[PDB]
Write a protein that binds this ligand. Structure first.
Ligand SMILES: [Cu+2]
Ligand SMILES: [Cu+2]
Ligand SMILES: [O]
Ligand SMILES: [O]
Lengths: 325, 325
């Protein structure tokens, strides 16, 4: 729970206490002088497999609430006069592992009056090749209109080879992008690069790089456009796509185009929302999208006919291939 | 007649050799000839309580003499409180004495002793009387079976004697190290007298309110618990654990004590799980009750029968919790 809780005396702090409960299971009675578990730091918690069992448990609590609302109707979902004619991607969807280095110098003891030496860790990390979405829309209103583009990747089959219904897919879908763009009258193709995702941020610049850039500016006088780096909150760009398999896997790419005027009311459409607003919001500003998080996949969809009848929603099959070493 | 000397002597005689018909001719004569309903002007309720008890007696609905009695047995308690209610309505001592003598010879001795003690304590007519110690009135409830057996042997052989009491169990039982606390005859008198002074069955219609009773209930038992733990600390033992309905009761108990009528007190094995008790409650009922009490505590209010809230975020809250717990 957070300090926004209306009643912590009654509702307690389920999630934060659970982190400690799990983290301490190696020494639950303090007999062994063991330090806190990996679950007791946000730096480390996702290293523990139990992180995801705990958070699925918590996720299902939220899901009982979100499932309690009536399914969306045609009128709920329709962006009148906006149809998605096609969805395609420029570039193959390819994942691989590459190598990344970071410095261990801060971990080791130095001094006094003894020189340092370069000490690095090299890790293998998931990555993917660049691609660009091609989303063809037709705006059959006689005016340009702001639209929200909501992009999700959804499984088609489970690990047993069983084809999933839309209701069984929706809670498994992962957010790939969300952006606001003016759609002029007529039929037009919207292009969106994978690198520009509002879900992701680039790899952090190294400490050594930050020192070099700051030192070069201070010792001299140079206004470096530091307004370049994203934020550190956001799924790493390299992890935008799931690993998939060497033999390839097919997924549903789900695109919902919604009324940007209504979605952004109170926060403007032309305004800059930063590079990570989908899950990390906008630093020092209100959250720019009024819709429920997960829209339009966050309510039950018992009747797939409802979604199929909405011209501003479309999904297509895409293939992701893993390229092993 | 109602002087302190006579009232004290009357109480002494009524409690003398409690398992046999009275040996005092004056009490014999009263029990034979007194009619609790003969003159209902002696009662502040014009005989209502005496009518209730006489009807139960005449219909043969009362517990027989020479039978175990437990204050926690609902029907046996109700029968004892029927006699208390009569004594409590007596305006003058001769009513109190005569009803006590009459019902001594009709009612179960355990019920009678209980009713007479709380009748003396809670009637103005009992002011100035000193109640004999229960360990000399019903010694079986304060004395182990081995010593009672030696007393029976002394009586069978018509020989006086004084017999040394030892503790139960063996030195192999570390709990025996603190037996001097819970087996002390005065500590047991403290405990039963507190409950006689502050009975859970008290209703203010009996005459007066028992101020802060629910908070005193918390406090006297908190002090018993804390004092016992101090004896454990004194004897190289850890503090007691708390019981829980879903966890084993680690420490069993062999009382090695007996009722005068009803047999030996039962033993409880080490390391047993709670079982449902027929005619009392399911273990699950205890857990639900516990949950409801904690709901009130964590809400900050007790829920009334009609659903309205009773605030306990105030100094009387602990007392109201004592009332409901
Ligand atoms: Cu968490
Ligand atoms: Cu008690
Ligand atoms: O977390
Ligand atoms: O978290």
């Amino acid at each position: 729970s957070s300090m926004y809780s209306p009643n912590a005396q009654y509702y307690g702090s389920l999630h934060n206490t659970a982190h400690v409960m799990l983290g301490r299971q190696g020494d639950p009675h303090g007999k062994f002088n063991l330090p806190p578990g990996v679950m007791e730091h946000f730096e480390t918690a996702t290293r523990d497999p139990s992180f995801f069992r705990l958070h699925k448990y918590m996720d299902n609590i939220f899901k009982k609430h979100t499932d309690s609302f009536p399914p969306y109707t045609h009128d709920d979902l329709e962006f009148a006069g906006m149809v998605v004619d096609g969805v395609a991607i420029d570039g193959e969807l390819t994942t691989f592992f590459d190598e990344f280095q970071y410095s261990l110098i801060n971990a080791v003891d130095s001094g006094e009056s003894i020189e340092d030496v370069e000490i690095n860790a090299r890790v293998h990390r998931l990555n993917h090749k660049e691609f660009t979405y091609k989303i063809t829309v037709s705006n059959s209103i006689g005016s340009d209109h702001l639209a929200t583009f909501r992009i999700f990747l959804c499984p088609i089959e489970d690990n047993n080879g069983i084809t999933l219904t839309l209701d069984k897919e929706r809670w498994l879908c992962i957010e790939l992008d969300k952006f606001f763009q003016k759609v002029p009258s007529g039929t037009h193709t919207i292009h969106r690069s994978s690198k520009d995702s509002s879900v992701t941020v680039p790899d952090m610049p190294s400490f050594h790089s930050l020192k070099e850039q700051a030192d070069n500016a201070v010792n001299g006088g140079s206004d470096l456009d530091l307004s370049a780096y994203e934020r550190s909150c956001g799924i790493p760009e390299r992890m935008l796509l799931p690993k998939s398999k060497p033999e390839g896997m097919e997924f549903n790419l789900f695109v919902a185009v919604t009324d940007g005027v209504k979605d952004t009311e109170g926060h403007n459409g032309d305004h800059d929302h930063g590079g990570t607003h989908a899950q990390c919001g906008v630093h020092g500003e209100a959250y720019p999208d009024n819709r429920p998080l997960g829209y339009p996949l966050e309510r039950r969809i018992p009747d797939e006919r409802v979604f199929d009848g909405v011209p501003n929603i479309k999904h297509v099959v895409v293939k992701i291939v893993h390229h092993p070493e | 007649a109602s002087s302190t000397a006579h009232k004290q002597q009357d109480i002494n005689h009524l409690l003398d050799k409690i398992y046999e018909d009275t040996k005092y001719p004056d009490l014999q004569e009263i029990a034979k000839n007194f009619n609790p309903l003969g003159d209902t002007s002696m009662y502040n309720d014009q005989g209502a309580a005496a009518e209730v008890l006489m009807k139960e007696l005449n219909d043969h609905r009362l517990l027989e003499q020479h039978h175990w009695y437990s204050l926690f047995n609902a029907r046996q308690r109700e029968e004892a409180l029927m006699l208390f209610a009569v004594l409590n309505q007596c305006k003058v001592w001769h009513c109190f004495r005569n009803n006590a003598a009459y019902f001594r010879e009709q009612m179960n001795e355990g019920e009678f002793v209980y009713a007479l003690y709380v009748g003396v304590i809670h009637s103005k007519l009992g002011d100035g009387i000193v109640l004999p110690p229960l360990y000399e009135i019903t010694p079986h409830m304060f004395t182990n079976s081995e010593v009672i057996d030696k007393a029976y042997s002394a009586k069978m052989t018509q020989k006086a004697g004084t017999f040394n009491v030892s503790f139960t169990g063996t030195k192999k039982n570390k709990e025996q190290r603190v037996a001097y606390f819970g087996e002390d005859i005065g500590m047991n008198i403290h405990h039963v007298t507190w409950h006689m002074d502050f009975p859970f069955w008290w209703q203010d219609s009996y005459g007066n309110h028992l101020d802060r009773k629910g908070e005193l209930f918390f406090w006297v038992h908190h002090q018993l618990t804390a004092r016992f733990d101090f004896e454990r600390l004194s004897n190289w033992l850890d503090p007691v654990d708390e019981l829980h309905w879903d966890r084993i009761i680690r420490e069993g108990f062999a009382p090695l004590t007996s009722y005068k009528y009803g047999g030996e007190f039962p033993v409880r094995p080490d390391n047993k799980h709670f079982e449902d008790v027929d005619g009392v409650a399911h273990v699950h009922d205890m857990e639900i009750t516990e949950n409801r009490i904690y709901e009130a505590i964590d809400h900050g209010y007790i829920t009334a029968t009609d659903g309205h809230t009773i605030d306990i975020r105030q100094p009387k809250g602990i007392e109201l919790l004592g009332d409901i717990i």
